[PDB]
Curated annotation (Swiss-Prot), chain A:
Free-text note regarding domains: The holoenzyme may undergo conformational shifts upon DNA binding: the nuclease domain of RecB may swing away from the DNA exit tunnel in RecC. When Chi DNA binds to the RecC tunnel the nuclease domain may then swing back to its original position (that seen in crystal structures), allowing it to nick the DNA 3' of the Chi site and then rotate to load RecA. At high Mg(2+) the nuclease domain may swing back more frequently, explaining differences seen in assays performed at high Mg(2+).
Gene name per UniProt: recD
Zinc among keywords: no
Similarity section: Belongs to the RecD family.
GO cellular component annotations of the record: exodeoxyribonuclease V complex
Summary of the function given for this chain in its UniProt record: A helicase/nuclease that prepares dsDNA breaks (DSB) for recombinational DNA repair. Binds to DSBs and unwinds DNA via a rapid (>1 kb/second) and highly processive (>30 kb) ATP-dependent bidirectional helicase. Unwinds dsDNA until it encounters a Chi (crossover hotspot instigator, 5'-GCTGGTGG-3') sequence from the 3' direction. Cuts ssDNA a few nucleotides 3' to Chi site, by nicking one strand or switching the strand degraded (depending on the reaction conditions). The properties and activities of the enzyme are changed at Chi.
One biological process term in Gene Ontology: double-strand break repair via homologous recombination
Organism: Escherichia coli (strain K12)
Full protein segment contained here: 2 to 124 of 608
Protein name: RecBCD enzyme subunit RecD
Keyword check for Transmembrane: no
UniProtKB/Swiss-Prot annotation, chain B:
Native source organism of the sequence: Escherichia coli (strain K12)
Family (UniProt): Belongs to the RecC family.
Residue numbers of the full-length protein present here: 397 to 1121 of 1122
Molecular functions (GO terms): ATP binding; DNA binding; DNA helicase activity; exodeoxyribonuclease V activity
DNA damage in keyword set: yes
Phenotype when the gene is knocked out: Decreased degradation of DNA with free ends that is unable to undergo homologous recombination, which can fortuitously lead to more efficient viral infection. Cells are deficient in DNA recombination repair and have increased sensitivity to UV light. The cultures have many inviable cells. Cells can be transformed with retron Ec48-containing plasmids.
Protein name: RecBCD enzyme subunit RecC
Protein's job: A helicase/nuclease that prepares dsDNA breaks (DSB) for recombinational DNA repair. Binds to DSBs and unwinds DNA via a rapid (>1 kb/second) and highly processive (>30 kb) ATP-dependent bidirectional helicase. Unwinds dsDNA until it encounters a Chi (crossover hotspot instigator, 5'-GCTGGTGG-3') sequence from the 3' direction. Cuts ssDNA a few nucleotides 3' to Chi site, by nicking one strand or switching the strand degraded (depending on the reaction conditions). The properties and activities of the enzyme are changed at Chi.
Curated annotation (Swiss-Prot), chain D:
Gene: recB
Protein family according to the UniProt entry: Belongs to the helicase family. UvrD subfamily.
Record note on quaternary structure: Heterotrimer of RecB, RecC and RecD. All subunits contribute to DNA-binding. The C-terminus interacts with RecA. Interacts with YgbT (Cas1).
UniProt protein name: RecBCD enzyme subunit RecB
Effect of gene knockout: Decreased degradation of DNA with free ends that is unable to undergo homologous recombination, which can fortuitously lead to more efficient viral infection. Cells are deficient in DNA recombination repair and have increased sensitivity to UV light. The cultures have many inviable cells. Cells cannot be transformed with retron Ec48-containing plasmids.
Additional facts recorded: In the RecBCD complex, RecB has a slow 3'-5' helicase, an exonuclease activity and loads RecA onto ssDNA, RecD has a fast 5'-3' helicase activity while RecC stimulates the ATPase and processivity of the RecB helicase and contributes to recognition of the Chi site.
Coiled coil: none
Domain of life: Bacteria
Residue range from the parent sequence: 71 to 209 of 1180
Source organism of the structure: Escherichia coli (strain K12)
Swiss-Prot record, chain E:
Disruption phenotype: Decreased degradation of DNA with free ends that is unable to undergo homologous recombination, which can fortuitously lead to more efficient viral infection. Cells are deficient in DNA recombination repair and have increased sensitivity to UV light. The cultures have many inviable cells. Cells can be transformed with retron Ec48-containing plasmids.
Name this protein carries in UniProt: RecBCD enzyme subunit RecC
Swiss-Prot/TrEMBL domain comment: The holoenzyme may undergo conformational shifts upon DNA binding: the nuclease domain of RecB may swing away from the DNA exit tunnel in RecC. When Chi DNA binds to the RecC tunnel, the nuclease domain may then swing back to its original position (that seen in crystal structures), allowing it to nick the DNA 3' of the Chi site and then rotate to load RecA. At high Mg(2+) the nuclease domain may swing back more frequently, explaining differences seen in assays performed at high Mg(2+).
Span within the parent record: 67 to 132 of 1122
Mutagenesis or variant effect for W4A: Does not act at Chi
The family this protein is said to belong to: Belongs to the RecC family.
Further comment: In the RecBCD complex, RecB has a slow 3'-5' helicase, an exonuclease activity and loads RecA onto ssDNA, RecD has a fast 5'-3' helicase activity while RecC stimulates the ATPase and processivity of the RecB helicase and contributes to recognition of the Chi site.
Domain of life: Bacteria
């Protein structure tokens, strides 16, 4: 799959091997779009990002033909919200899941607690 | 060398029968020689150790797929600085790795596929994959929510120090890939680049390493070159090549510093005879010289002994005579005479026995010139033999305790008194002169826990008890500890849980039968002109109620005693109670505030004297001595001589340990003060116990 | 309980359920009988298969391999070469043999003349039942061989002692519970007949029992009275012989008694604290030679671990003052108090470890253990302080133990990990035991029976000869085939056979104990009862070894035991009562 | 000790045979039984110098020196590394067994197992004494 | 080596090193022995090796024979 390509990207130093580990261990054999999403969110978390809009990661497509590789699953996967929610590694905020999406933004769940409490503090 | 004026250290030679076992002692003493009595040396025929950790690590990697990959062996591989620098592992992060692999529960093999390969049932936990899953879910999220795929998060890593996790992960996938690779049999022409691939895949070369890399590459090239030039075509497994490499690598030796100039140490090379003035020999016991090598069994030369044959036995017998005739001035012959363990008898070799027999039958001492041939022979044998001793050495320490000055602050915390009174003997050391015995971190456990004992099961019992007093569920907490991996696999966890909960229920319902809603309160009271400040947590308004899953002890009860004293100092009418296991109970009645302050003053002066000099207050053995002697009916001191032996018996049997209880005397805090218990210190301890602990039984009920 | 059909006159069956209930009760229900065998096969199989992939070898495996090579068809060819090479065999101490080894010997040398075989051993002194040594193979061999010879001389002990030990074992025939070990009398030597032991003029009886006073007694009384009594008599001998009162002469050449010529023999270890404390209460030097304790148990290992840790990490104040606070540096409260407040004197000790660690890295293990030994000059400190030689010798022994690891290992983390690794596990290796601090001068020796084989002593005591412990584990040999057959279910017949074998072993122990006393030895005896109710008239002395020698299997009491003692009491054996004094 | 006593005995016997006058009665009766003193002395001279390789062994040493002499029938390796800490190996093996024969067992079956003993450590401690040596026949 | 140098100097048509070396006959015997087995004279080696082997005993025998 993508393990050799992302090891090559680690040799390219664009994406951290820690991001590779996080994406591998919470993806396994799930959707490749979910794997790339986990890798990029772990990458910006290692950068120090706090928010992550879906449009930015969608139109980045830094390493791979994202659309032409991701379109393999059931139905219209372009509706990315429940396309991700089909996977077991994300939840809307009901279960103790590492991945939570609230405002069309996908990020870490402790960071989701912090971001939702400051978002309800702000707006 | 002091007796003779001029003799060059070039002109002294010492041979030895066996070199490798003798070498560490020679090197140690010749490196530990003093300043003026120093003389250099030059050891020859040392075993070749050029890059020892690198060679051992590469041999361990070449022994990969047949190992179960214990975490101890993994870290004993990981300690190498070259691998640490290549896989960017730092020494400061190595401690974090040590504690995380010790506490996160990584004990068994690498992965469940390997476990199933070894035909064992798939446990599904306690692997490196399980530990990394634990670590990464701890990085992702806290351990308060629960479980995501029935594995427990591990909140010891949630910061920027988490890079070592991915480093170790990359290391373990490299190990997994090469474990898959290095199993199948291959022919020689593709066994050729495997060593090169391993070297470039693992090791970043350093300034020194290239010698070791060249040695490994040259040996690999030579082995497969011999194989290819010998015209073999079939595939061969990895084990034969691994053992051949391991045998051939250490077969190299050093014979490059024979005549450096200082004194020389070497084994007896065959036919080697050089003139010298001083020749010394070592280790001529029986059974070690000459070394006996039996023929292989199918030899035909040994059946027909011809003229030109060579035997190792006769070679050594010739070398001894050649070494004897190759001496000019002095000879130094020594052997191990008596075994040092049981003082039994050993014997010198037959060659030395023949030499001393010829010497004894050769000459006579000048004393008894005409007495008897055999008596003169025995006298010469006794005179020439020298006998050494077993030990080379064939102000005193004072009493450790000394008086010290100390001041009395007007404001002291309650926690200071509690920590002092918990164990005063070690409290004198741990806080006054700022010394404590910071023991090194323990070993990583070998396998998964079968039974639970000690502090772990004590913490489990405490976590069960603080929910039992709330009467909340036990099943979710049981699932949480099963995800923690602190319970036996399968239904044995439920079997253990049933016994633990049914045993703690009888402690729980007693607390429920008298639990009342209380509150915390802050102590601000003075005694002997000394203000005492402290916080008293969770005190019920109608009395006191404490509970703890532990066995009953006098030091445990005296905490409740001090609690009741400080409670009665702040007004505080009502009794006090404490619950323990086996329904052990304590009861203290309220008293006068002046009496409470009097007892507090007594304890304050006791602390004041104990801080200046380490006052001996044994809480349990002294209590055992003082309890049976005291009679509760008269509230006085019996002093009958009949009890003067029962008290000795029970005090000794409580102090020194049994086979089931840890020895109270087996404690380094007490071992530092003295090596052996003395009756005078016993009487002093009895006196201090009678002076201090005696109010406890006056009001225990 | 009442389903026995005989209970009609006690408390007709008339239906078969009332006797099928006892049929069900007669068979115990357990899974251990299956799981023990199922595990026992596979553990041995798995170990024997796992050793193959490493190619190692063991003493147990080597003899089994040789036996299997005999079991193969080429055994005749394999034995012919051995017969040609060695046409003789001699075996010493034959009492420790296994049926495997005897099968090898029998197969190689049970035939084929021009080749002989000489076996030398003793049916007695076979005290290695837990060392894999079987006694029944000796009788199995004797049922095939038919030449028996016996020596007569002794060369060591007094003729009176020889006569007494002949008489006391000549009480009842075949006393060893076996018709294959008949004790026959032996004679003394003609040059030791002038050996005498006097006490204020006249001589002394060689053998002597000491007896309790009371209808019943327990193990606590057995220890408390007799340890004090034995210590009192040893003190009496020690005080008397120092003034030339009691003498040990062979004819006329006499000498006084000292500490070295006085020893004691015991059974186990847990009892020995009582004997040591009772002996040292009268200020007598006692050493326990039977100890095989590892040196890693003592506090010297802890201090060495602390010193190595502090010299590896000399940065923090706490880890350095931990090393300086140890007893071996030898400081005081004022010393530490001045060391805390003086920054310059603190920094001197800080700076010396900075160079010491570099010397450690450059030089290994041993030279720095020599250098820190020499620098602080703590040899003379422990020489001046009494009892410090025991603390001193363990440091040198630990230093010699560290050299086998300091070369094969190089990382400084590895050695300090290794020391704490061996702290928690006291391995029973022969090199791990403690060396003797003073084996040079006159002390008092306390040794057990198992190490007492072959060591001669002038005089010796024996306090604990009456006590015994009943075996309860099912393990017995057949009375005909002599095969060690193990029974899972509890068979009382097998239990009785095992108890008879255990009693034979205890009598062999008694024969071992009543030797190696050239002048005199003595012991005590009690009418101890294992039963709960005391005065039933049924003592339990005959259950032990010595009780069978006097009661001959009779339930007796103090009066009958007294009559049995004084029946044979004549001028060589002398009896005495013992009071708690 | 036996080898040294043997060497001293043969040396003293050779000297006493060359001097024809002894002190020990055993050597006296042997010298009485001597047929040819010169032949006996020659044999003792040729035998004393061969002492260094004489056959005195333990059982383990004897079989070790015999199998490496004739190991064709055995089929064992020529060179091996000995071992003594087999207790840890047996402790690993018993726990390895206890993993596979207890974990898939159901609760009702495993309850009786839990009653009689808990751990494989105690299981090994119970049955260790019969593992070494020869396995016994089970009634 | 000196005698080999004299051989090279005097006797012609001989290579500088022979094909008979302590490691050469190891692999030569490795190749030869299974082919040479069952010749009605290798029954001892057949009993030694044919029971079970992963060429370890064969390698040891090859080295000893070399």
């Amino acid at each position: 799959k993508l393990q050799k390509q992302l090891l090559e990207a680690v040799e390219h130093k664009q994406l951290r091997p820690l991001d590779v580990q996080f994406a591998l261990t919470v993806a396994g054999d799930e959707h490749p779009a979910v794997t790339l999403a986990a890798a990029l969110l772990s990458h910006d978390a290692g950068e120090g990002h706090v928010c992550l809009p879906l449009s930015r990661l969608e139109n980045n497509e830094a390493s791979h033909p994202l659309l032409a590789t991701c379109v393999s699953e059931i139905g219209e996967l372009q509706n990315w919200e429940e396309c991700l929610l089909a996977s077991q590694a994300v939840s809307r905020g009901d279960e103790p899941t590492p991945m939570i999406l609230c405002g069309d933004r996908l990020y870490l769940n402790r960071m989701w607690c912090n971001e939702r409490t400051v978002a309800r503090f702000f707006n | 060398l002091e007796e003779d004026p001029t003799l060059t250290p070039r002109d002294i030679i010492v041979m030895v029968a066996d070199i490798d076992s003798y070498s560490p002692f020679i090197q140690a003493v010749f490196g530990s020689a003093p300043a003026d009595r120093y003389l250099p040396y030059a050891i020859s025929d040392r075993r070749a150790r050029q890059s020892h950790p690198v060679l051992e690590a590469f041999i361990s990697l070449l022994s990969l797929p047949d190992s179960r990959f214990v975490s101890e062996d993994v870290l004993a591989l990981l300690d190498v600085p070259v691998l640490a620098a290549r896989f960017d592992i730092t020494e400061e992060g190595l401690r974090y790795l040590r504690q995380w692999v010790n506490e996160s529960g990584i004990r068994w093999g690498i992965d469940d596929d390997n476990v199933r390969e070894l035909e064992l049932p798939a446990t599904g936990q306690h692997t490196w994959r399980f530990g990394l899953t634990r670590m990464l879910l701890g990085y992702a999220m806290e351990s308060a929510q629960g479980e995501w795929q029935s594995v427990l998060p591990y909140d010891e890593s949630s910061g920027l120090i988490a890079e070592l996790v991915g480093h170790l992960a990359s290391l373990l996938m490299q190990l997994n890939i090469w474990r898959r690779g290095l199993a199948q049999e291959r022919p020689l022409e593709e066994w050729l680049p495997v060593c090169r691939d391993m070297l470039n895949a693992f090791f970043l070369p350093d300034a020194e390493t290239e010698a070791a890399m060249t040695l490994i590459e040259q040996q690999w090239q030579a082995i497969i070159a011999e194989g290819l030039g010998a015209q073999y075509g079939d595939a061969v497994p990895l084990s034969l090549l691994r053992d051949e490499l391991a045998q051939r690598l250490d077969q190299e030796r050093i014979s490059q510093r024979f005549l450096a100039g200082p004194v020389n140490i070497c084994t007896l090379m065959p036919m080697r005879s050089i003139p010298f003035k001083v020749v010394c020999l070592l280790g001529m016991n029986d059974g070690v010289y000459p070394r006996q090598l039996a023929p292989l069994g199918f030899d035909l030369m040994s059946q027909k002994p011809k003229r030109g044959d060579r035997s190792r036995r006769d070679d050594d017998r010739y070398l001894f005579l050649e070494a004897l005739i190759s001496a000019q001035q002095k000879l130094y012959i020594s052997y191990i005479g008596r075994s040092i363990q049981d003082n039994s008898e050993r014997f010198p070799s037959v060659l030395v026995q023949e030499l001393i027999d010829y010497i004894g039958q050769s000459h006579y001492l000048p004393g008894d010139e005409a007495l008897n041939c055999d008596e003169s022979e025995a006298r010469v044998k006794a005179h020439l033999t020298c006998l050494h001793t077993r030990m080379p050495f064939d102000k005193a320490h004072s009493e450790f305790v000394q008086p010290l000055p100390f001041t009395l602050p007007e404001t002291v915390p309650l926690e200071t008194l509690q920590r002092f009174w918990a164990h005063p003997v070690r409290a004198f050391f741990q806080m006054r002169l700022q010394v404590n015995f910071r023991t090194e971190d323990s070993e990583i456990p070998d396998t998964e826990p079968f039974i639970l004992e000690g502090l772990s099961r004590y913490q489990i019992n405490q976590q069960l008890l603080n929910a039992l007093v709330e009467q909340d569920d036990a099943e979710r907490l049981f699932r949480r500890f099963r995800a923690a991996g602190d319970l036996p696999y399968g239904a044995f966890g439920e079997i253990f849980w049933e016994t633990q909960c049914q045993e703690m229920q009888q402690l729980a319902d007693r607390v429920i039968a008298c639990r009342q809603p209380g509150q915390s309160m802050e102590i601000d009271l003075a005694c002997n002109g000394v203000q005492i400040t402290g916080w008293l947590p969770q005190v019920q308004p109608d009395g006191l109620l404490r509970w703890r899953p532990s066995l009953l002890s006098v030091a445990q009860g005296m905490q409740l005693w001090l609690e009741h004293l400080v409670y009665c100092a702040s007004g505080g009418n009502g009794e006090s109670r404490l619950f323990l296991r086996k329904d052990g109970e304590w009861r203290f009645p309220p008293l006068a505030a002046e009496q409470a302050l009097h007892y507090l003053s007594q304890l304050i002066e006791g602390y004041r004297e104990g801080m200046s000099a380490p006052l001996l207050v044994l809480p349990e053995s002294g209590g055992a001595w003082l309890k049976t002697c005291y009679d509760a009916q008269n509230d006085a001191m019996l002093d009958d001589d009949s009890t003067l032996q029962k008290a000795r018996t029970k005090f000794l049997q409580a102090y020194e340990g049994n086979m089931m209880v840890r020895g109270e005397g087996d404690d380094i805090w007490y071992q530092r003060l003295w090596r052996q218990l003395t009756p005078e210190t016993m009487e002093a301890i009895v006196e201090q116990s009678q002076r201090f602990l005696l109010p406890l039984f006056r009001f225990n009920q | 309980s009442y389903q026995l059909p005989e209970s009609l006159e006690k408390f007709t069956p008339r239906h078969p359920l009332f006797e099928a209930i006892d049929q069900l009760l007669a068979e115990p229900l357990s899974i251990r009988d299956l799981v023990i065998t199922r595990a026992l096969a596979e553990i041995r199989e798995t170990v024997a298969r796992e050793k193959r992939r490493r190619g190692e070898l063991g003493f147990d495996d080597m003899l089994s391999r040789l036996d299997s090579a005999l079991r193969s068809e080429s055994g005749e060819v394999l034995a012919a070469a051995i017969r040609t090479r060695f046409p003789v065999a001699m075996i010493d101490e034959f009492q420790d043999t296994d049926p495997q080894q005897y099968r090898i010997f029998r197969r190689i040398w049970h035939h084929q003349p021009e080749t002989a075989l000489l076996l030398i051993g003793d049916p007695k002194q076979a005290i290695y039942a837990f060392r894999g040594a079987d006694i029944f193979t000796y009788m199995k061999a004797r049922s095939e061989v038919h030449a028996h010879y016996t020596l007569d001389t002794n060369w060591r002990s007094a003729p009176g002692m020889v006569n007494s030990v002949n008489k006391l074992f000549s009480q009842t025939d075949d006393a060893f519970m076996f018709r294959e070990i008949p004790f026959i009398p032996v004679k003394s030597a003609g040059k030791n007949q002038a050996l005498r032991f006097v006490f204020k003029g006249e001589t002394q009886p060689a053998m002597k029992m000491w007896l309790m006073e009371g209808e019943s007694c327990g193990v606590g009384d057995y220890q408390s009275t007799m340890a004090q009594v034995c210590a009192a008599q040893i003190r009496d001998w020690l005080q008397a012989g120092q003034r030339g009162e009691a003498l040990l002469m062979n004819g006329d050449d006499a000498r006084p008694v000292r500490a070295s010529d006085i020893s004691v023999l015991v059974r186990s270890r847990q009892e020995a604290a009582q004997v040591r404390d009772a002996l040292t209460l009268l200020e007598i030097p006692s050493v326990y030679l039977s100890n095989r304790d590892s040196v890693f148990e003592t506090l010297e290992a802890q201090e060495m671990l602390w010193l190595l840790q502090a010299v590896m990490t000399p940065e923090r104040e706490n880890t350095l003052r931990s090393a300086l606070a140890t007893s071996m540096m030898g400081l005081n409260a004022l010393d530490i108090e001045t060391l805390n407040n003086d920054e310059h004197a603190w920094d001197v000790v800080v700076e010396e470890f900075d160079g010491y660690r570099q010397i450690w890295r450059k030089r290994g293990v041993m030279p720095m253990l020599r250098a820190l030994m020499s620098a602080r000059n703590i040899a003379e400190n422990l020489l001046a302080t009494a009892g410090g030689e025991r603390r001193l010798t363990d440091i040198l022994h630990i230093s010699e133990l560290l050299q086998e690891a300091g070369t094969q290992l190089e990382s400084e983390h590895a050695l300090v990990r290794w020391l704490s690794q061996h702290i928690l596990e006291p391995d029973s290796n022969a090199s791990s035991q403690q060396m003797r601090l003073e084996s040079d001068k006159h002390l008092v020796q306390i040794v057990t029976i198992h190490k007492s084989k072959g060591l001669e002593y002038p005089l010796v005591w024996l306090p604990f000869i009456t006590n015994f412990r009943v075996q309860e584990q099912a393990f017995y040999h057949d009375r005909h085939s002599f095969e060690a057959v193990l029974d899972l279910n509890a068979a009382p017949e097998s239990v009785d056979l095992a108890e008879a074998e255990r009693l034979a072993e205890d009598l062999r122990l008694l024969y071992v104990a009543l030797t190696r006393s050239v002048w005199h030895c003595s012991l005590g005896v009690a009418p101890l009862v294992r039963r709960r109710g005391d005065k039933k008239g049924d003592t339990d002395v005959h259950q032990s070894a010595l009780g069978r020698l006097l009661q001959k299997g009779e339930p007796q009491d103090a009066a009958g035991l007294r009559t049995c003692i004084e029946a044979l009491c004549d001028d060589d054996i002398a009896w005495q009562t013992a009071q708690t004094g | 000790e036996l080898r040294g006593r043997i060497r001293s005995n043969i040396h003293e016997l050779r000297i006493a045979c060359l001097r024809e006058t002894t002190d020990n009665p055993l050597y006296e009766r042997l010298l009485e039984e001597i047929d040819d003193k010169a032949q006996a002395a020659q044999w003792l001279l040729l035998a004393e110098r061969q002492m260094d390789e004489a056959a005195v062994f333990t059982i383990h040493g004897f079989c070790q020196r015999m199998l490496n002499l004739n190991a064709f029938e055995s089929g064992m390796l020529f060179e091996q590394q000995l071992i003594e800490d087999e207790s840890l190996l047996r402790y690993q093996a018993c726990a390895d067994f206890w993993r596979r024969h207890c974990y898939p067992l159901p609760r009702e079956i495993a309850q009786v197992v839990f009653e009689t003993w808990k751990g494989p450590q105690a299981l090994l401690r119970d049955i260790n004494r019969y593992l070494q040596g020869e396995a016994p026949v089970i009634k | 080596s000196f005698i080999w140098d004299m051989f090279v100097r005097v006797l012609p048509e001989i290579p500088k090193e022979s094909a008979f070396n302590k490691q050469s006959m190891s692999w030569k015997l490795m190749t030869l022995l299974p082919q040479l087995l069952e010749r009605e004279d290798f029954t001892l080696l057949r009993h030694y090796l044919t029971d079970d082997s992963d060429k370890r005993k064969l390698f040891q025998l090859s080295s000893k024979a070399a």
